[PDB]
PDB file of C-alpha atoms in Angstrom:
ATOM      1  CA  UNK A   1     -92.246 154.575-107.645  1.00  0.00           C
ATOM      2  CA  UNK A   2     -92.703 157.965-109.400  1.00  0.00           C
ATOM      3  CA  UNK A   3     -90.621 160.717-107.644  1.00  0.00           C
ATOM      4  CA  UNK A   4     -92.551 164.019-107.315  1.00  0.00           C
ATOM      5  CA  UNK A   5     -90.500 166.662-108.963  1.00  0.00           C
ATOM      6  CA  UNK A   6     -88.535 164.072-110.976  1.00  0.00           C
ATOM      7  CA  UNK A   7     -84.914 162.913-110.474  1.00  0.00           C
ATOM      8  CA  UNK A   8     -83.392 160.415-108.071  1.00  0.00           C
ATOM      9  CA  UNK A   9     -81.361 162.715-105.895  1.00  0.00           C
ATOM     10  CA  UNK A  10     -81.985 163.771-102.364  1.00  0.00           C
ATOM     11  CA  UNK A  11     -80.420 163.881 -98.938  1.00  0.00           C
ATOM     12  CA  UNK A  12     -79.208 160.422 -97.769  1.00  0.00           C
ATOM     13  CA  UNK A  13     -79.647 160.049 -94.004  1.00  0.00           C
ATOM     14  CA  UNK A  14     -76.395 158.633 -92.514  1.00  0.00           C
ATOM     15  CA  UNK A  15     -76.756 159.061 -88.714  1.00  0.00           C
ATOM     16  CA  UNK A  16     -79.728 159.737 -86.532  1.00  0.00           C
ATOM     17  CA  UNK A  17     -78.971 160.700 -82.889  1.00  0.00           C
ATOM     18  CA  UNK A  18     -81.008 158.866 -80.280  1.00  0.00           C
ATOM     19  CA  UNK A  19     -84.032 160.836 -79.000  1.00  0.00           C
ATOM     20  CA  UNK A  20     -83.514 163.570 -81.631  1.00  0.00           C
ATOM     21  CA  UNK A  21     -86.395 165.131 -83.604  1.00  0.00           C
ATOM     22  CA  UNK A  22     -85.233 162.998 -86.563  1.00  0.00           C
ATOM     23  CA  UNK A  23     -85.424 159.820 -84.435  1.00  0.00           C
ATOM     24  CA  UNK A  24     -88.954 160.817 -83.343  1.00  0.00           C
ATOM     25  CA  UNK A  25     -89.998 161.413 -86.926  1.00  0.00           C
ATOM     26  CA  UNK A  26     -88.918 157.883 -87.733  1.00  0.00           C
ATOM     27  CA  UNK A  27     -85.839 158.608 -89.926  1.00  0.00           C
ATOM     28  CA  UNK A  28     -83.732 155.467 -90.536  1.00  0.00           C
ATOM     29  CA  UNK A  29     -80.012 155.649 -91.170  1.00  0.00           C
ATOM     30  CA  UNK A  30     -78.846 154.310 -94.503  1.00  0.00           C
ATOM     31  CA  UNK A  31     -82.230 153.588 -96.063  1.00  0.00           C
ATOM     32  CA  UNK A  32     -83.896 157.005 -95.964  1.00  0.00           C
ATOM     33  CA  UNK A  33     -83.418 159.844 -98.430  1.00  0.00           C
ATOM     34  CA  UNK A  34     -85.090 163.210 -97.786  1.00  0.00           C
ATOM     35  CA  UNK A  35     -86.715 164.047-101.171  1.00  0.00           C
ATOM     36  CA  UNK A  36     -88.786 167.210-100.330  1.00  0.00           C
ATOM     37  CA  UNK A  37     -89.525 169.512 -97.419  1.00  0.00           C
ATOM     38  CA  UNK A  38     -93.035 171.109 -97.226  1.00  0.00           C
ATOM     39  CA  UNK A  39     -93.438 169.997-100.929  1.00  0.00           C
ATOM     40  CA  UNK A  40     -90.256 171.847-102.014  1.00  0.00           C
ATOM     41  CA  UNK A  41     -88.213 169.306-103.970  1.00  0.00           C
ATOM     42  CA  UNK A  42     -84.614 168.875-102.675  1.00  0.00           C
ATOM     43  CA  UNK A  43     -82.882 168.008-105.909  1.00  0.00           C
ATOM     44  CA  UNK A  44     -79.995 170.446-105.702  1.00  0.00           C
ATOM     45  CA  UNK A  45     -76.947 170.393-103.429  1.00  0.00           C
ATOM     46  CA  UNK A  46     -77.610 173.994-102.101  1.00  0.00           C
ATOM     47  CA  UNK A  47     -78.543 175.699 -98.796  1.00  0.00           C
ATOM     48  CA  UNK A  48     -82.306 175.329 -99.130  1.00  0.00           C
ATOM     49  CA  UNK A  49     -82.625 172.483 -96.668  1.00  0.00           C
ATOM     50  CA  UNK A  50     -80.366 174.142 -93.982  1.00  0.00           C
ATOM     51  CA  UNK A  51     -82.165 177.433 -94.343  1.00  0.00           C
ATOM     52  CA  UNK A  52     -85.717 176.012 -94.198  1.00  0.00           C
ATOM     53  CA  UNK A  53     -84.888 173.970 -91.128  1.00  0.00           C
ATOM     54  CA  UNK A  54     -83.591 177.085 -89.373  1.00  0.00           C
ATOM     55  CA  UNK A  55     -86.664 179.100 -90.482  1.00  0.00           C
ATOM     56  CA  UNK A  56     -88.904 176.429 -89.023  1.00  0.00           C
ATOM     57  CA  UNK A  57     -87.373 175.911 -85.598  1.00  0.00           C
ATOM     58  CA  UNK A  58     -90.003 174.737 -83.142  1.00  0.00           C
ATOM     59  CA  UNK A  59     -92.590 174.228 -85.940  1.00  0.00           C
ATOM     60  CA  UNK A  60     -93.604 171.063 -87.771  1.00  0.00           C
ATOM     61  CA  UNK A  61     -92.186 170.479 -91.245  1.00  0.00           C
ATOM     62  CA  UNK A  62     -93.523 167.872 -93.665  1.00  0.00           C
ATOM     63  CA  UNK A  63     -90.808 165.650 -95.246  1.00  0.00           C
ATOM     64  CA  UNK A  64     -91.190 163.405 -98.112  1.00  0.00           C
ATOM     65  CA  UNK A  65     -88.916 160.406 -97.688  1.00  0.00           C
ATOM     66  CA  UNK A  66     -87.772 157.673-100.122  1.00  0.00           C
ATOM     67  CA  UNK A  67     -86.721 154.420 -98.510  1.00  0.00           C
ATOM     68  CA  UNK A  68     -84.318 152.068-100.231  1.00  0.00           C
ATOM     69  CA  UNK A  69     -85.600 149.381 -97.806  1.00  0.00           C
ATOM     70  CA  UNK A  70     -89.356 149.529 -98.778  1.00  0.00           C
ATOM     71  CA  UNK A  71     -88.728 151.216-102.190  1.00  0.00           C
ATOM     72  CA  UNK A  72     -91.672 153.499-101.230  1.00  0.00           C
ATOM     73  CA  UNK A  73     -92.223 157.170-100.532  1.00  0.00           C
ATOM     74  CA  UNK A  74     -93.741 158.346 -97.296  1.00  0.00           C
ATOM     75  CA  UNK A  75     -94.512 161.630 -95.633  1.00  0.00           C
ATOM     76  CA  UNK A  76     -93.523 162.252 -92.034  1.00  0.00           C
ATOM     77  CA  UNK A  77     -93.546 165.325 -89.915  1.00  0.00           C
ATOM     78  CA  UNK A  78     -90.601 166.648 -87.936  1.00  0.00           C
ATOM     79  CA  UNK A  79     -90.145 169.512 -85.624  1.00  0.00           C
ATOM     80  CA  UNK A  80     -86.618 170.993 -85.939  1.00  0.00           C
ATOM     81  CA  UNK A  81     -85.597 172.248 -82.540  1.00  0.00           C
ATOM     82  CA  UNK A  82     -82.958 174.047 -80.596  1.00  0.00           C
ATOM     83  CA  UNK A  83     -84.427 172.685 -77.360  1.00  0.00           C
ATOM     84  CA  UNK A  84     -83.900 169.003 -77.540  1.00  0.00           C
ATOM     85  CA  UNK A  85     -80.448 168.713 -76.021  1.00  0.00           C
ATOM     86  CA  UNK A  86     -78.187 167.394 -78.807  1.00  0.00           C
ATOM     87  CA  UNK A  87     -76.411 168.689 -81.888  1.00  0.00           C
ATOM     88  CA  UNK A  88     -78.348 169.887 -84.915  1.00  0.00           C
ATOM     89  CA  UNK A  89     -81.908 170.996 -85.324  1.00  0.00           C
ATOM     90  CA  UNK A  90     -82.955 167.548 -86.548  1.00  0.00           C
ATOM     91  CA  UNK A  91     -80.071 165.627 -84.940  1.00  0.00           C
ATOM     92  CA  UNK A  92     -79.368 163.844 -88.239  1.00  0.00           C
ATOM     93  CA  UNK A  93     -76.313 163.750 -90.524  1.00  0.00           C
ATOM     94  CA  UNK A  94     -77.011 163.809 -94.280  1.00  0.00           C
ATOM     95  CA  UNK A  95     -75.206 163.707 -97.568  1.00  0.00           C
ATOM     96  CA  UNK A  96     -76.648 164.822-100.946  1.00  0.00           C
ATOM     97  CA  UNK A  97     -76.698 161.624-103.029  1.00  0.00           C
ATOM     98  CA  UNK A  98     -78.657 159.546-105.525  1.00  0.00           C
ATOM     99  CA  UNK A  99     -81.004 156.773-104.393  1.00  0.00           C
ATOM    100  CA  UNK A 100     -81.051 155.120-107.835  1.00  0.00           C
ATOM    101  CA  UNK A 101     -79.926 151.524-107.338  1.00  0.00           C
ATOM    102  CA  UNK A 102     -79.354 151.997-103.590  1.00  0.00           C
ATOM    103  CA  UNK A 103     -81.284 148.832-102.692  1.00  0.00           C
ATOM    104  CA  UNK A 104     -79.057 146.752-105.079  1.00  0.00           C
ATOM    105  CA  UNK A 105     -75.732 146.976-103.368  1.00  0.00           C
ATOM    106  CA  UNK A 106     -76.354 144.682-100.406  1.00  0.00           C
ATOM    107  CA  UNK A 107     -74.715 141.373 -99.466  1.00  0.00           C
ATOM    108  CA  UNK A 108     -76.897 138.786 -97.874  1.00  0.00           C
ATOM    109  CA  UNK A 109     -75.352 136.657 -95.123  1.00  0.00           C
ATOM    110  CA  UNK A 110     -76.174 132.985 -95.646  1.00  0.00           C
ATOM    111  CA  UNK A 111     -74.968 130.092 -93.506  1.00  0.00           C
ATOM    112  CA  UNK A 112     -72.231 131.076 -91.005  1.00  0.00           C
ATOM    113  CA  UNK A 113     -69.638 128.408 -90.083  1.00  0.00           C
ATOM    114  CA  UNK A 114     -68.963 127.944 -86.329  1.00  0.00           C
ATOM    115  CA  UNK A 115     -65.800 129.708 -85.113  1.00  0.00           C
ATOM    116  CA  UNK A 116     -65.305 131.530 -88.370  1.00  0.00           C
ATOM    117  CA  UNK A 117     -64.314 135.214 -88.727  1.00  0.00           C
ATOM    118  CA  UNK A 118     -67.966 135.829 -89.567  1.00  0.00           C
ATOM    119  CA  UNK A 119     -69.233 134.066 -86.427  1.00  0.00           C
ATOM    120  CA  UNK A 120     -66.590 135.897 -84.242  1.00  0.00           C
ATOM    121  CA  UNK A 121     -67.771 139.219 -85.672  1.00  0.00           C
ATOM    122  CA  UNK A 122     -71.368 138.383 -84.765  1.00  0.00           C
ATOM    123  CA  UNK A 123     -72.785 137.965 -88.346  1.00  0.00           C
ATOM    124  CA  UNK A 124     -76.158 136.216 -88.156  1.00  0.00           C
ATOM    125  CA  UNK A 125     -77.234 133.659 -90.774  1.00  0.00           C
ATOM    126  CA  UNK A 126     -80.015 134.621 -93.218  1.00  0.00           C
ATOM    127  CA  UNK A 127     -81.292 137.711 -91.320  1.00  0.00           C
ATOM    128  CA  UNK A 128     -78.161 139.888 -91.783  1.00  0.00           C
ATOM    129  CA  UNK A 129     -77.480 142.007 -94.876  1.00  0.00           C
ATOM    130  CA  UNK A 130     -74.181 143.825 -95.229  1.00  0.00           C
ATOM    131  CA  UNK A 131     -75.231 147.214 -96.648  1.00  0.00           C
ATOM    132  CA  UNK A 132     -72.004 149.238 -96.556  1.00  0.00           C
ATOM    133  CA  UNK A 133     -68.533 149.970 -95.220  1.00  0.00           C
ATOM    134  CA  UNK A 134     -66.444 153.152 -94.794  1.00  0.00           C
ATOM    135  CA  UNK A 135     -65.586 152.801 -98.469  1.00  0.00           C
ATOM    136  CA  UNK A 136     -68.022 152.606-101.436  1.00  0.00           C
ATOM    137  CA  UNK A 137     -69.012 149.032-102.682  1.00  0.00           C
ATOM    138  CA  UNK A 138     -70.565 147.753-105.607  1.00  0.00           C
ATOM    139  CA  UNK A 139     -70.218 144.706-107.837  1.00  0.00           C
ATOM    140  CA  UNK A 140     -66.541 145.483-108.792  1.00  0.00           C
ATOM    141  CA  UNK A 141     -65.443 147.136-105.594  1.00  0.00           C
ATOM    142  CA  UNK A 142     -67.462 144.445-103.751  1.00  0.00           C
ATOM    143  CA  UNK A 143     -67.458 142.685-100.414  1.00  0.00           C
ATOM    144  CA  UNK A 144     -64.756 140.118-101.403  1.00  0.00           C
ATOM    145  CA  UNK A 145     -62.358 142.720-102.817  1.00  0.00           C
ATOM    146  CA  UNK A 146     -62.662 144.671 -99.595  1.00  0.00           C
ATOM    147  CA  UNK A 147     -62.095 141.537 -97.479  1.00  0.00           C
ATOM    148  CA  UNK A 148     -58.935 140.902 -99.571  1.00  0.00           C
ATOM    149  CA  UNK A 149     -57.461 144.309 -98.839  1.00  0.00           C
ATOM    150  CA  UNK A 150     -58.287 143.695 -95.101  1.00  0.00           C
ATOM    151  CA  UNK A 151     -56.582 140.413 -94.606  1.00  0.00           C
ATOM    152  CA  UNK A 152     -55.568 140.273 -90.874  1.00  0.00           C
ATOM    153  CA  UNK A 153     -56.991 143.786 -90.285  1.00  0.00           C
ATOM    154  CA  UNK A 154     -60.224 144.734 -88.535  1.00  0.00           C
ATOM    155  CA  UNK A 155     -62.823 145.847 -91.094  1.00  0.00           C
ATOM    156  CA  UNK A 156     -66.024 147.733 -90.156  1.00  0.00           C
ATOM    157  CA  UNK A 157     -69.223 146.694 -91.976  1.00  0.00           C
ATOM    158  CA  UNK A 158     -72.711 148.267 -91.614  1.00  0.00           C
ATOM    159  CA  UNK A 159     -75.259 145.452 -91.290  1.00  0.00           C
ATOM    160  CA  UNK A 160     -79.030 145.439 -91.430  1.00  0.00           C
ATOM    161  CA  UNK A 161     -80.907 142.660 -89.600  1.00  0.00           C
ATOM    162  CA  UNK A 162     -84.455 141.673 -90.450  1.00  0.00           C
ATOM    163  CA  UNK A 163     -85.331 140.388 -86.950  1.00  0.00           C
ATOM    164  CA  UNK A 164     -84.417 143.694 -85.285  1.00  0.00           C
ATOM    165  CA  UNK A 165     -85.207 145.849 -88.369  1.00  0.00           C
ATOM    166  CA  UNK A 166     -82.194 147.962 -87.632  1.00  0.00           C
ATOM    167  CA  UNK A 167     -78.633 148.528 -88.546  1.00  0.00           C
ATOM    168  CA  UNK A 168     -75.460 147.981 -86.505  1.00  0.00           C
ATOM    169  CA  UNK A 169     -71.730 148.226 -86.989  1.00  0.00           C
ATOM    170  CA  UNK A 170     -69.887 144.912 -87.111  1.00  0.00           C
ATOM    171  CA  UNK A 171     -66.114 144.684 -86.948  1.00  0.00           C
ATOM    172  CA  UNK A 172     -64.701 141.580 -88.688  1.00  0.00           C
ATOM    173  CA  UNK A 173     -61.070 140.419 -89.029  1.00  0.00           C
ATOM    174  CA  UNK A 174     -60.682 138.440 -92.264  1.00  0.00           C
ATOM    175  CA  UNK A 175     -58.373 135.385 -91.560  1.00  0.00           C
ATOM    176  CA  UNK A 176     -57.405 133.044 -94.429  1.00  0.00           C
ATOM    177  CA  UNK A 177     -56.000 130.687 -91.727  1.00  0.00           C
ATOM    178  CA  UNK A 178     -59.428 130.173 -90.125  1.00  0.00           C
ATOM    179  CA  UNK A 179     -59.506 126.592 -91.476  1.00  0.00           C
ATOM    180  CA  UNK A 180     -61.884 126.723 -94.358  1.00  0.00           C
ATOM    181  CA  UNK A 181     -61.872 128.278 -97.763  1.00  0.00           C
ATOM    182  CA  UNK A 182     -61.388 132.062 -98.153  1.00  0.00           C
ATOM    183  CA  UNK A 183     -61.173 134.502 -95.215  1.00  0.00           C
ATOM    184  CA  UNK A 184     -64.774 135.007 -94.120  1.00  0.00           C
ATOM    185  CA  UNK A 185     -66.426 131.693 -93.231  1.00  0.00           C
ATOM    186  CA  UNK A 186     -70.055 132.419 -94.256  1.00  0.00           C
ATOM    187  CA  UNK A 187     -71.922 132.184 -97.529  1.00  0.00           C
ATOM    188  CA  UNK A 188     -72.939 135.399 -99.287  1.00  0.00           C
ATOM    189  CA  UNK A 189     -75.824 136.100-101.648  1.00  0.00           C
ATOM    190  CA  UNK A 190     -76.020 139.107-104.005  1.00  0.00           C
ATOM    191  CA  UNK A 191     -78.507 140.248-106.596  1.00  0.00           C
ATOM    192  CA  UNK A 192     -82.281 140.250-107.047  1.00  0.00           C
ATOM    193  CA  UNK A 193     -82.633 136.953-105.295  1.00  0.00           C
ATOM    194  CA  UNK A 194     -80.931 138.396-102.179  1.00  0.00           C
ATOM    195  CA  UNK A 195     -82.423 141.773-101.533  1.00  0.00           C
ATOM    196  CA  UNK A 196     -83.674 143.134 -98.244  1.00  0.00           C
ATOM    197  CA  UNK A 197     -87.326 142.192 -97.600  1.00  0.00           C
ATOM    198  CA  UNK A 198     -89.448 145.276 -98.528  1.00  0.00           C
ATOM    199  CA  UNK A 199     -92.262 144.973 -95.888  1.00  0.00           C
ATOM    200  CA  UNK A 200     -90.826 145.107 -92.405  1.00  0.00           C
ATOM    201  CA  UNK A 201     -94.341 146.107 -91.081  1.00  0.00           C
ATOM    202  CA  UNK A 202     -97.653 144.488 -91.891  1.00  0.00           C
TER     203      UNK A 202
END
């Protein structure tokens, strides 16, 4: 998709508080990137977004969003507010980041062996995709490297599920003694044959 205003940077949505203006606007943690507000392109790490949200309290604002789930842009309206009850005008935590390649660094959960660390953590075969951790991953710093450094230690993973179309935190304790090979006990897919399905809604 062509990005209006060029570039691949924008504000990555990390947390969306329940019942906030952001939640009502449909912002999705992890997959959404705010690209523009009212057509102003947010391609600089500056105060423009903070200041425009304050200027627009109690008024609708049009966001342009890129999703690393659908790989599409969309426009949605949000009303920043001081009246809603929680912290923030939107209720959303963001980080200025690039969305280039963001849909590539996901690990698809395949079969899950009974009584394995994966099964005990609640990983669900075929519908779960591990999309992050509290540390950066990619192909070198990947899932298996991280599981190595966490042998016998709880490890938090952020997991998208296609049946629920949402993300959750899963805590797994890698255990090389579990009985099978490695420390995880499920298959894992990575690459273009194992990406998140791009059309959660028909």
